[PDB]
Design a protein around this ligand. Structure first.
Ligand SMILES: Nc1nc2c(ncn2[C@@H]2O[C@H](COP(=O)(O)OP(=O)(O)NP(=O)(O)O)[C@@H](O)[C@H]2O)c(=O)[nH]1
Ligand SMILES: Nc1nc2c(ncn2[C@@H]2O[C@H](COP(=O)(O)OP(=O)(O)NP(=O)(O)O)[C@@H](O)[C@H]2O)c(=O)[nH]1
Ligand SMILES: [Mg+2]
Ligand SMILES: [Mg+2]
Lengths: 557, 171, 146, 226, 507, 134
């Protein structure tokens, strides 16, 4: 946190001049020349405090004006250290909106990229922990209703075709903050006051209950909205209809992800479709039910009628053109080498939007039927038949390439680390988790690689949940402990790699380390790190992740 | 509401239906007769089916009531723990069979900081190893997906002196 | 001489140490006889941090709760993995059967069988009572003739 | 052979509606073609039956129109133009043609021909059916023929030869017997609009001298038999 | 002669090739590639039928495809006055030891049945009848008036390809044989011995489209044209031309209610583009035989540069507002749209219509030559021909302009056709009015042709324009040689007048 | 001298009546005729095809405009062609022998310099016009 881990890019005044004419989604990161995230912009005095910490860094000898943006009202807040002005496309409301939009960007940049392991394309960015920049967690809640009703301007995730007061980046950020900080009583108190003027905000309260471990309280509340005449649904015909579909979607997904119960989950999923047949999530749920119900006939039919996202994209950090201050291995050049032409040119990789989610279901279908039996189903209902939606047909071409690659690999096995990544990601796409974990584990021995580490970490998380769900005494004590140690061993390594590339915040690693914390005490985890690793490394994990769990979780442990 | 339609293009999958009010409707062929061909006139009679609505309405209420009955209404209860036997340096604690309305138990923790019970449903008894004439307190913490419930704190005083070496079988 | 005194929690390590002179951390005191003893916490949380003190250790005092029968299996696992440590290769081994005053306490011969000391560097087990001080200086005498 | 399908009303706006079936079909359907009490999430019965009585009605109507189009356009094929002679003088001649008959030709251009296309093109073939040739020679033979250019084809025929009258031949002289001034008017025997350039009863003088012969109302003066 | 030859193999960049120009470094069009010996006399032709770059069949296809390119490059760009984007191209007259027109006919059946590979114009479902090959044929036959040559060839084609009778119908209409054509159309749509179950349906629609368009463009009679247009729609509701015709009928029938409905259900072209003319980039030899100026709201008119069907639809929209007015149009609009949903693209055209009406009114209520062009094009789009002709004439006085000249020329053509029709339903007034137009046409044709020669263009608009005068006055040659110089008159003689004198089959 | 006028006016007849002193059989002139009588008279065809080619002879030009007095119909056409506006150029009443021929006074009114009633066949009033031209 000291001089190092702060990237820089060199004519004076080039920074804001390129930002000034590019004003015409959530927006760009806060420019300082380097970019930065996780700054407490709730108060101008608190900003000067941050700048104070930066100007207290200007001392000593280095070894060779921030500008936050809000999407609610498209204007740029520049503050020079004190000149403060606004760049267009009541005083308290200005700092309020820019703070909320800032927090949304800090969270959604890690949530929209959760599939890619929170990958960071922009190098010159310094990402802080937004929860430890306070209290930011509590401040977001108390400042939420003031910024509510304008959350639609933030649009919605790429998998959401029809945004609303409930489905948007603002609410998605809220439910994520409340879940991580376990601030139930704080958010519940705020939302109940919001319902009084906005009865449709009860849907948000339901999602909070599910996130804060209140299933029964949530289902009891859902039934109240979908049955009781005193609900807000029973009072337009389109604004109210999308609220009903969301409730049905939540209810159906709850029935599916947990509680098994595919039969009852199907009846709710179909009603969700009848409320919003143009929505992706409705058809996406119903397709998952059909797969779970071993009905591959209607699974292909429901997958075909499933609408795709053709315009919207995932949120990423974006003047196009470096100083890299280096803060155990961390060395040499990766890739920049030859690879199997048919292995790296896999079109099934780098799939975006709903097309990626659809491909996962397709691989889940071919896992049961097989490629030969799949063509029998395909030729039966596609060209009393219906036309294929092209994008689905393309996924079949992509599926054939992956199955061929995976089979040609396993037949041969019966390789460079990057080649192990590509095969591992290929096996993961087809749903071969243990065979992919081996590929990632082999590639982890010859070299580090972030892809292998993040994917192998998720493997242990899944292995941990599996044992707890399926559950002698001696087997449990040994299997869990071995997993927990392997989890901690991976979390430390990834966090150290993130710190090298100016990343101090990772929701994946926070959730990952939280798994061990629930098992072994908060103090035991720390000593586990300080034992296998060095003292300053354990201190790093302590500041980035462990300090959040120790205090900023509202005494969860 | 009955309207006469003209068949424009007719493919194996879809069809283009044209009205006199210049409406163009893409319509699935399988819902058309077998001898439709192309350039034919079809009579489409659309009527509302109230009895089918009442069937689905009753079905929907049946499903919603079924979900509420299975998940919800039934809540997890009290984590009551009792005292089996107390010695001078150890005591055996037990608890009534855990009753959970809905899944699932996340963790069962003893409080006096103490360890987590490995098999709460199989083994309902725990024996405190290390502890003479010293007051201690215990209480269970039931963390479920339905909510966290801790209650029934129990205090006890260890007995006084008033899976013995000289009384061994080899002594 | 540098001595590392470890063992399970509630064994009586702190009691033994300050008789010669819950622990969340460690305690180091120098005791004169005719020994720089390093006492580290026995809790599961601190038990992992024992490896930091394994280096440059000349003698190891393993305090065992004789009265507590239940965790003699747990006491075995912790000791058997310490003997395999390269840092404690040439270090002496002194087992203290503490709380010998208590009735249900196991004899020194009985604990030796449970710990498996006969499968072993020089070692010696001594029945001790930290409250009274019996057999504490007796153990230090053998620890000096290493 | 009626096909009965039960559909569910998905989303519904002021214009279109989305119908969903059990076989997972999503049909875009106009709301105006739906019942009054449709709302949203309601079940409708769509009976699709073929109308054979309407097919023959449209068939009979299609053949009727095509036959009427054929009868008006593409049946009457017109028409050779008949060239005639009105009057010939010593230095001029007046040509005319019968009213051009064109059922649905239509006319493009009517061109006069005298040993080539050297002559003019008729401005108003329908409004004016007469043309006068100005520049000619005394007692000289000529020939003329009309070219009818039509977008159904070009039909030209009936070429007519004529010889201009001699000075002793006064058979082409017409005065004002005609009461009205026409194209073939050669002489005009209280102000009026009158003539552009048409030349006193002179008529007696032509009878005595046995030839065509100054007789203005401005010139000098110098007996009509009863 | 040395000049009129731009200058600047190394781009096998094929794989990604519609019709495809002949590279010689400069490009060239109108070369007789029917025979290799004839090519050596002139000293790389391409054919789209079979994608190969250049035994008798090979030279046959490359010749036919070459001629198609030479003609369609002038026909598809007819709306923009045959504008040429590529400068390094040299275009000859394709019609000028064997007449190319007659060679195209004798070589037509050998290249037939493969015309579908040439695709279709941007306003078209391609077929054996609707394609660039047939479009080129009917254009050549129309210009050269080679009726008896094409008629003999097509009659032999019908014996083995009965669907080719549609082509013969289009030829008859072009070569002044309406009655023979309508008799032939009715033969296909009524007589049981006609070739008219899936391939024929697109042919029936084309016949109905031709018949309906024939009923509309000439003979007025909107009533009967309506009954056929609706039948054409029921045969091809996905076609643009079918709905485009029906919309025109409604406008002429003063029924603006259904005119907007038919215009809304009218499908648009979203993929296909108009045909235009290797290595991204000069020597410009000017033969002997500039802007850089500024109204910001006048040049930013989105109604300009409209392409494909969107332009044709906008023309009908301006034709509607001409009768009703903007206020009455919105009443119709709000009456039948939100009811049924507007197709967005139509709604955008309303925004564009408002911009043109605003611009036109602000100009008339209230200048550089370019400003006269922009306003002139605006008035022309709204249907204000005499007000637009004035703008083009004024802008042509301060400076020469190809945009102004071509548009002013088209004005006299429309005015000429108008008088000849009005004269049917004094004499000296007609004779003088026509003569004044003919002289103005010739005066403009010479100037534009001289401008084309400067930009390496020796070749349809100008040919048809001068052809109007030729039909009126014999005399044309001496008219040009009088007002202009001798070498200029010689230029017009070679480019346009030589074609009319000989290569029109003694028309 | 440039001698022009409508077709059939008698231009060629007038020219060769002054040149050869003999009335020759004249034909429609497809081109032009130039003879020296010292008057260098340039006779150009009067047909519509050749009438446009008059501009070539306007330079360095006295103008003799022969008018067919007998032809009443084309007196309007003879007026328009004459109606003088040419910068390079900054009347013979021929066929006076014919009965229906207009008098010299009448043609002057229609045309709106010097006019002379001439007769190319007889030669009357040809030299009278030349005297004024000198
Ligand atoms: N009866 C008896 N009790 C003893 C004896 N030695 C220690 N104790 C008791 O054992 C308990 C634990 O003492 P302590 O020294 O803290 O043990 P520890 O091993 O240090 N615990 P930790 O290391 O985990 O802090 C105390 O209550 C102490 O009185 C002994 O010899 N006899
Ligand atoms: N009666 C009569 N005929 C005359 C007189 N002058 C010329 N003509 C006749 O007019 C006719 C035309 O003669 P011409 O000189 O060719 O006229 P033009 O103006 O030269 N015609 P163009 O220029 O078109 O060839 C001849 O037949 C000639 O005899 C005249 O004084 N009297
Ligand atoms: Mg201690
Ligand atoms: Mg002459």
């Amino acid at each position: 946190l000291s001089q190092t881990s702060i990237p820089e890019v060199k004519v004076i005044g080039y920074a804001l001049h390129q930002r000034r004419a590019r004003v015409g989604d959530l927006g760009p990161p806060d420019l300082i020349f380097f970019y930065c995230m996780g700054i407490d912009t709730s108060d101008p005095t608190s900003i000067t405090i941050f700048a104070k910490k930066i100007t207290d860094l200007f001392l000593d000898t280095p070894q060779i004006s921030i500008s936050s943006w809000n999407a609610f009202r498209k204007y740029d807040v520049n503050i020079i250290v004190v000149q403060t002005y606004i760049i267009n496309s009541n005083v308290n409301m200005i700092w309020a909106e820019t703070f909320m939009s800032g927090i949304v960007r800090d969270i959604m940049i890690m949530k929209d990229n959760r599939a890619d392991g929170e990958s960071q394309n922009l190098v010159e960015t310094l990402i802080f922990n937004p929860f430890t920049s306070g209290d930011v967690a509590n401040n977001f809640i108390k400042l939420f209703p003031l910024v509510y009703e304008k959350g639609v301007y933030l649009d919605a995730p790429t998998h959401v075709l029809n945004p609303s007061l409930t489905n948007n980046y603002l609410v998605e950020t809220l439910v994520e903050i409340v879940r991580l900080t376990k601030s139930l009583e704080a958010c519940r108190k705020m939302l109940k006051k919001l319902i009084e003027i906005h009865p449709e905000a009860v849907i948000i309260l339901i999602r909070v209950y599910f996130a804060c471990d209140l299933e029964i309280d949530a289902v009891d509340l859902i039934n109240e909205q979908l049955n009781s005449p005193s609900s807000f649904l029973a009072d337009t015909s389109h604004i109210q209809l999308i609220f009903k579909s969301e409730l049905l979607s939540i209810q159906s997904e709850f029935l599916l992800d947990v509680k098994r119960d595919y039969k009852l989950a199907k009846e709710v999923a179909m009603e969700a479709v009848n409320c919003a047949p143009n929505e992706f999530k409705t058809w996406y749920l119903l397709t998952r039910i059909y797969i779970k119900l071993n009905d591959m006939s209607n699974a292909l039919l429901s997958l075909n009628a499933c609408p795709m996202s053709q315009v919207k994209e995932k949120y990423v950090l974006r003047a196009p053109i470096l100083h890299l201050p280096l803060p155990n291995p961390m060395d040499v050049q990766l890739e920049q080498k030859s690879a199997d032409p048919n292995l790296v040119n896999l079109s099934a990789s780098s799939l975006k939007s709903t097309f990626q989610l659809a491909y996962k279901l397709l691989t889940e279908i071919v896992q049961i039927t097989g490629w030969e039996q799949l063509l029998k189903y395909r030729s039966k209902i596609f060209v009393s038949k219906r036309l294929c939606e092209r994008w689905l047909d393309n996924l079949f071409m992509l599926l054939y390439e992956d199955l061929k690659t995976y089979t040609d690999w396993q037949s041969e096995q019966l390789k460079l680390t990057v080649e192990w990544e590509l095969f591992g990601l290929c096996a993961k796409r087809l749903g071969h988790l243990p065979e992919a974990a081996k590929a990632f584990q082999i590639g982890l021995s010859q070299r580090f690689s972030p892809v292998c580490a993040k994917n192998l970490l998720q493997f242990y998380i899944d292995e941990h949940k599996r044992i707890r769900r399926d559950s002698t005494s001696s087997q449990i004590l040994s299997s869990i402990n071995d997993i927990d140690s392997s989890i901690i061993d991976l979390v430390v390594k990834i966090c150290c790699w993130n710190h090298r590339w100016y990343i101090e915040f990772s929701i994946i690693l926070i959730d990952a380390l939280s798994v061990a914390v629930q098992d072994m005490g908060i103090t035991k985890v720390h000593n586990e790190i300080a034992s296998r690793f060095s003292d300053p490394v354990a201190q790093l994990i302590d500041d980035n992740i462990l300090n959040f769990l120790k205090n900023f979780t509202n005494d969860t442990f | 509401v009955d309207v006469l339609l003209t068949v424009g293009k007719l493919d194996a999958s879809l069809a283009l239906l044209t009205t006199q009010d210049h409406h163009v409707i893409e319509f699935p062929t399988v819902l058309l007769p077998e001898n439709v061909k192309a350039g034919s006139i079809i009579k489409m009679q659309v009527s509302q089916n109230l009895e089918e609505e009442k069937k689905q309405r009753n079905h929907f209420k049946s499903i919603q009531a079924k979900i509420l009955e299975k998940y919800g209404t039934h809540k997890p209860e009290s984590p009551v723990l009792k005292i089996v036997n107390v010695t001078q340096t150890s005591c055996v604690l037990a608890w009534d069979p855990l009753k959970l309305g809905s899944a699932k138990l996340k963790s069962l923790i003893l409080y006096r900081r103490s360890m987590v019970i490995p098999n709460p449903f199989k083994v309902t008894t725990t024996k405190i190893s290390g502890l003479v004439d010293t007051p201690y307190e215990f209480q269970l913490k039931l963390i479920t997906t339905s909510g966290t419930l801790w209650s029934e704190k129990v205090i006890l005083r260890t007995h006084k002196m008033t899976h013995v070496r000289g009384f061994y079988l080899d002594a | 001489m540098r001595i590392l005194m470890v063992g399970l929690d509630g064994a009586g390590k702190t009691t033994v140490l300050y008789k010669l002179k819950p622990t969340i951390g460690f305690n180091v005191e120098t005791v004169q006889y005719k020994f720089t003893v390093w006492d580290v916490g026995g809790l599961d949380r601190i038990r992992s941090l024992w490896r930091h003190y394994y280096r440059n250790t000349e003698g190891v005092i393993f305090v065992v709760d004789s009265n507590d029968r239940s965790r003699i299996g747990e006491a075995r696992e912790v000791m058997q993995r310490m003997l395999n440590e390269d840092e404690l290769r040439n270090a002496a081994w002194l087992v203290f059967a503490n709380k010998q005053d208590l009735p249900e306490a196991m004899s020194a011969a009985e604990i030796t069988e449970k710990l498996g000391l006969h499968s072993i560097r020089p070692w010696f087990i001594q029945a001790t009572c930290a409250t009274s001080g019996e057999g504490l200086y007796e153990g230090l005498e053998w620890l000096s003739n290493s």
